Amino acid sequence: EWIWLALGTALMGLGTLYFLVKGMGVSDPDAKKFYAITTLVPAIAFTMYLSMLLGIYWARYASWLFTTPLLLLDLALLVDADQGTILALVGADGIMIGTGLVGALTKVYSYRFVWWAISTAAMLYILYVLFFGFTSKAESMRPEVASTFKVLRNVTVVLWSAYPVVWLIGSEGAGIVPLNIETLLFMVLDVSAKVGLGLILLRSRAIF
Ligand SMILES: *C/C=C(C)/C=C/C=C(C)/C=C/C1=C(C)CCCC1(C)C
Numbered sequence: 001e002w003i004w005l006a007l008g009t010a011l012m013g014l015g016t017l018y019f020l021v022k023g024m025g026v027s028d029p030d031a032k033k034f035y036a037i038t039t040l041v042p043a044i045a046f047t048m049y050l051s052m053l054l055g056i057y058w059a060r061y062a063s064w065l066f067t068t069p070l071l072l073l074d075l076a077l078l079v080d081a082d083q084g085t086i087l088a089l090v091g092a093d094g095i096m097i098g099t100g101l102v103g104a105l106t107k108v109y110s111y112r113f114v115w116w117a118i119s120t121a122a123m124l125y126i127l128y129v130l131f132f133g134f135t136s137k138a139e140s141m142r143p144e145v146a147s148t149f150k151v152l153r154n155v156t157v158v159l160w161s162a163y164p165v166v167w168l169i170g171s172e173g174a175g176i177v178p179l180n181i182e183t184l185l186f187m188v189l190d191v192s193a194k195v196g197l198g199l200i201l202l203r204s205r206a207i208f
Helices: 002-024 029-054 057-078 083-105 109-139 143-169 179-202
Strands: none
Touching: 002 029, 002 179, 029 057, 029 179, 057 083, 057 109, 057 143, 057 179, 083 109, 109 143, 143 179
């Protein structure tokens, strides 16, 4: 279990460093914003993972709290989504993470179920907007933006959907997956979402 944590920490740190240095050689005002958000996300995750090493799993949850909104923001900026749409997405993200926590704080099965159903419903709304709403918006934009968004979209929807699955079969849920393995799964997901997506985004001309 300690290894996945050390691994996660290292991968997040290197991802952050890489995005930071890569961004230095960029001056485009549009590109810089993406570098800002994209570098900040793994920076936040690194801090939390390193913290878990120093210790702890609520720390990882807290990083989800900070990073999910920024990831959504990254996508919103790519398709130049209007403020309202973005606020709604971020608000839904807060509900997702918020209810996930409240459901975790309740001991009675029925309340937990509803809180997490609400959390899942919030995630589904987010995935719907990205997949359907953002896709039409991207297809009316320059080819590079449309193509890069489609890839980020596909990756995002797959990775995000995996979290509740792992959560539901892990120690917070049915208790089928051992803490040891769950930590591994969430680390792979976190790195893929916060370093993998950034790589795809920042290596594209779509940010200019
Ligand atoms: C870097 C971290 C990322 C992209 C984290 C994403 C986390 C989620 C999409 C979590 C979703 C959950 C539910 C839909 C139900 C309740 C439990 C959660 C919080 C694991």
